[PDB]
Every structure is written in structure tokens, then in C-alpha cells.
Design a protein around this ligand. Sequence first.
Ligand SMILES: CCCCCCCCCCCCCCCCCC(=O)OC[C@H](COP(=O)([O-])OCC(O)COP(=O)([O-])OC[C@@H](COC(=O)CCCCCCCCCCCCCCCCC)OC(=O)CCCCCCCCCCCCCCCCC)OC(=O)CCCCCCCCCCCCCCCCC
Ligand SMILES: CCCCCCCCCCCCCCCCC[C@@H](O)O[C@H](CO[C@H](O)CCCCCCCCCCCCCCC)COP(=O)(O)OCC[N+](C)(C)C
Lengths: 122, 175
Amino acid sequence: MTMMSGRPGRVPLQFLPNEARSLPPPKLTDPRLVYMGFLGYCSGLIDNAIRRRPVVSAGLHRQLLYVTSFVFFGYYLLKRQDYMYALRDHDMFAYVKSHPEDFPEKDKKTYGEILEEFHPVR
Amino acid sequence: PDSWDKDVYPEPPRRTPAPAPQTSLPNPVTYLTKIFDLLVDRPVTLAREFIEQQHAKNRYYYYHREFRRVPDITECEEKDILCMFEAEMQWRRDYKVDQEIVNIIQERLKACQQREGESYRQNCAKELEQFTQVSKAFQDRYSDLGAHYSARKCLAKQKQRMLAERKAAKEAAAA
Ligand SMILES: CCCCCCCCCCCCCCCCCC(=O)OC[C@H](COP(=O)([O-])OCC(O)COP(=O)([O-])OC[C@@H](COC(=O)CCCCCCCCCCCCCCCCC)OC(=O)CCCCCCCCCCCCCCCCC)OC(=O)CCCCCCCCCCCCCCCCC
Ligand SMILES: CCCCCCCCCCCCCCCCC[C@@H](O)O[C@H](CO[C@H](O)CCCCCCCCCCCCCCC)COP(=O)(O)OCC[N+](C)(C)C
């Protein structure tokens, strides 16, 4: 039930191992970052609405801080998520390579020589 | 005219009789035909001549697109998605072409039935047998595939028919 917490050489509380630096960082115009900024903007608008302030124009510095904080956190969140998926793929490929007898390559037949059953529609 | 090929859409030599009047009474159909000619067919012809004159000054062309022959579904391995996709596209194109062929044969049959008048039952036997052959072939190819049809299902139907025919031939060989 705990897949990758016990992976060897895993430092407890880094949130970003040094090996992650070999991966391309997400672009600053990543659509996920844009969505995080939109979430921050929505948080700012809801904050204005709750405090009975003009929703769109009241706090400009507060809305800017909201958007900036959301984007800042989302950048590192995306980095960690991409690194974790890279680890998953790396481990999967290494395990497949090291166990050829469990992932055999069987010759594939062409469809002219595979017999499929025909089910008429009527 | 010469716009359409006369081999794909043939017609008999169009024999028509010559008028042989038997009475001195004037024929009203001939007079009405002359009136119709002089009042309708000449202005229409002149308008068409002007239209063709304007069209001739601006001549451009459009081309019939040619498609290469790509490998069919029989020579694609089980999980090769690209070869499967190209074979399926080719098969769908061939299906449309076969539909149009059947349409041409049906047009021939309809034209024969209208043209032959009271003797269509005898003078349209060749068109009828042509349509019978094409209909049998098209049925064997594509019938009962149902919606969500594919080249794989057509291949399966063909293989089932081939197996049945081979078994019948083998059992007849022992008779
Ligand atoms: C999926 C793809 C993307 C989709 C986007 C997602 C959906 C929209 C985004 C959601 C979050 C954004 C807004 C949240 C904060 C707003 C809170 C609010 O109350 O608004 C009031 C406010 C109006 O009040 P005011 O102007 O201050 O003065 C009037 C008084 O306040 C008088 O006001 P009042 O308070 O006295 O009126 C009382 C009213 C007060 O009640 C409300 O106002 C309802 C507010 C509910 C908050 C929404 C929940 C939180 C977000 C979750 C959204 C879920 C979406 C998923 C689908 C489910 C649908 C429910 O109560 C009622 O009348 C009873 C209504 C009960 C009926 C049930 C329906 C209510 C819930 C419906 C929510 C639908 C989603 C939000 C739609 C937009 C709402 C503004 O609304 C606005 O003016 C702001 C709206 C957005 C404007 C910003 C746009 C930017 C400008 C253009 C820039 C272009 C950008 C791109 C550049 C392009 C190049 C040029
Ligand atoms: C509703 C959406 C959820 C919101 C969640 C709260 C968001 C605010 C939290 C503030 C962010 C700081 C938290 C972590 C920063 C530093 C701590 C870091 O070192 O923790 C590491 C771990 O990093 C954190 O766990 C990652 C936290 C990220 C949470 C976001 C995931 C949400 C799911 C998808 C929804 C998208 C959310 C959008 C963001 C607003 C330690 O790794 P490890 O000690 O080995 O793992 C402990 C658990 N084990 C051993 C059992 C495996």
C-alpha cells in the first residue's frame, strides 16, 4: 500500500532531491501554472466578496499577492510531481530490463493469418 | 453530350421515325413546336452563348485527386496502429467507390426500364443480370457488418466464407 516511500537512498524531508535537477524545469507559461494563478485570482475575488468590498477593484495589492503566492507554490509542486513521475518510469524500465523472463517478446502475427470470429449484425 | 463517358452510361442508337402525314389537316403540335422554338429556344440559346463567351475569358482547372495503394489490413500485425489506420482509411475509400459502382449500375437499370417502354421485361435482361452480379458481390463484401464496421470485420466475414467454401469443396472432392 506504500509503493515508493521505502525507495533506497531516499532522504526523508527534501521535497526535491538533487537528481531532480537533471529534468527540464516547467516553463513559466505552463498551463498548470496559469491555472494556479487563476485559482489565486479567484481566492482574491472571494476574499473581496466576503469582506463586503468591491469584488473586482478593492484590493489590488492583495490580489497580486494571492496570484504570486499561488504561482510560486505551483511551480515547485509541478517540479516535484514531474520528478516523481520520472522516478516511476525509470524504476519501471529498469525492472523490465532486469527481468526479461517476465516480459517476453513474442512474435506478432499479421491479421491475414490470425483467425477472428465474425458476428453478423441482423 | 461528350461531357460524360458514353461507355459507363451507354444507350441504344436512338432510332426515330420520319413523319408520314395522312391528312390535309394541319398538325397543331408542329405549329406549337415552331412557336416554342422561336419564342423560348432562341433567347435561351443567345443567353447561353453570352454566358459561354464570358466563361471563355476566365478558364481555370480543377484536378482529380489520386491516392496511392497502401498495404491493406491483411498485412498489418496485430497491434500496429499506424498500418491499421492507413489500411482502414483505404478500406473505407474502397467501400465508397464500390457504393458508387453499384449506384452506376442501378442508374443503368433504371434508364433501361424507362427507355424500353412496354418491352422492358425482355430488352433489359442484360442490365438486370449485371445488377444481380454486382449486388451479389457487394452483399458478400459488406452485408451484415452492421454499424461500427471495419476492415477487420470484413476480413473476418471473408475468412468465414472462405472456410465454409473450402470445407464444402473438400467434402465434394470425396464424392
Ligand atoms: C470551466 C472553465 C472556466 C470556468 C470558470 C469557473 C466559474 C467562474 C469562476 C469562479 C470564481 C470567480 C468569481 C468568484 C468571486 C466572486 C464572488 C461574487 O459574489 O461576485 C460578486 C461580483 C458582483 O458584485 P459587485 O460587482 O461587487 O457589486 C454588486 C453587489 O455586490 C451586489 O452583490 P450581492 O452580493 O449583494 O448579491 C447577492 C448574491 C450574491 O451571490 C453571488 O454573487 C454568487 C457567488 C458564488 C461564488 C462562486 C463559488 C466559488 C467558485 C466555485 C465555482 C464553481 C464552478 C463549477 C460549476 C458549478 C457551478 C456552481 O446572492 C444571490 O443573489 C443568491 C444567488 C443564489 C443562486 C445560486 C447560484 C450561486 C452559486 C453560483 C456559482 C457559479 C460560479 C461563479 C460564477 C461567477 C460569480 C461571480 O461579481 C463580480 O463582479 C466578479 C466576477 C468576475 C469578474 C472578473 C473578470 C475579470 C475582468 C476581465 C479580464 C479578462 C481576463 C482574460 C484576459 C483576456 C484578454 C482581454
Ligand atoms: C485541496 C487541495 C489540497 C491542499 C493541500 C494543502 C496545501 C498547503 C500545504 C503547504 C505546502 C508545504 C508542504 C510541504 C513543503 C515542505 C515539506 C516537504 O519536505 O515534505 C516532503 C513531502 O512533500 C509533501 O508531502 C508534498 C505536499 C504537496 C501537497 C499537494 C498535493 C495535492 C493533491 C493534488 C491537488 C492539487 C493541489 C493544488 C495546490 C493548491 C517530505 O517527504 P516525505 O517525508 O518522504 O513524505 C512523507 C509521507 N510519507 C513518508 C508517508 C510518504
